[PDB]
Amino acid sequence: LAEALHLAL
Ligand SMILES: [Co+2]
Numbered sequence: 001l002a003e004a005l006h007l008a009l
């Protein structure tokens with residue numbers, strides 16, 4: 001999750 005969201009943002 002941490003990784004995925006940082007890409008999104
Ligand atoms: Co990372």
Ligand SMILES: [Co+2]
Nearest residue numbers: 003005006007
């Ligand atoms: Co990064």
